[PDB]
């Protein structure tokens, strides 16, 4: 299917913007896990 200039890239932007809201929520969870891991390591380092 052929399309005129840039339409697919703007539809892709809109589609990604639709997903960004839940992506931020998941990102907060993953960054939370990372922070918890880092802190737990820091505790072992502190006791050492």
């Amino acid at each position: 299917i052929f399309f005129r200039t840039g339409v697919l890239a703007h539809l892709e932007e809109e589609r990604d913007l639709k997903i960004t809201d839940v992506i931020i929520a998941f990102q907060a969870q993953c960054r939370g896990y990372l922070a918890r891991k880092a802190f737990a390591k820091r505790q072992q380092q502190l006791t050492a």
Binding site: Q44, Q45, L46, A48
Partner: protein, 149 residues
């Protein structure tokens, strides 16, 4: 509290065997005749009051038991060289034996109980600091615990 009860059979045997070489008159005490003559036989003969000032650490006389508690209280808090090397390896994750002076400073001058700038300087003017400010803790633990030394 009674510190003597804290120590390993090997450590007690080492102290006992060492003491047996020093207790040359076999009276069980630390005395002017024995250790001064021994040190004169083993080195430069510092038989001056510098040694009396060391013998005077005990309350009056200096029995084997008092020697043991003195060295005990002095060893209170100390740990194995491998365990200390493990504790350092928690920061030196690559186990390079090459921890930086900035890292060492960060770990000590604010974090937890504060080491003084004088204590930090002591760790450079006696302990194994090296080029570019790398610090060889594998050598440090050896001289700290007096193991393989």
């Amino acid at each position: 509290s009674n510190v003597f009860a804290m120590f390993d059979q090997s450590q007690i045997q080492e102290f006992k065997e060492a003491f047996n070489m020093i207790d040359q008159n076999r009276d069980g005490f630390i005395d002017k005749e024995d250790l001064h003559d021994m040190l004169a036989s083993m080195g430069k003969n510092p038989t001056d009051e510098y040694l009396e000032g060391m013998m005077s650490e005990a309350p009056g006389p200096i029995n084997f038991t008092m020697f043991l508690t003195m060295f005990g209280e002095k060893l209170n808090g100390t740990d194995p060289e491998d365990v200390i090397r493990n504790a350092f390896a928690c920061f030196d994750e690559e186990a390079s034996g090459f921890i930086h002076e900035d890292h060492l400073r960060e770990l000590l001058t604010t974090m937890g109980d504060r080491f003084t700038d004088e204590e930090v300087d002591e760790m450079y003017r006696e302990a194994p600091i090296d080029k570019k400010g790398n610090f060889n803790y594998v050598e440090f633990t050896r001289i700290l615990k007096h193991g393989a030394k």
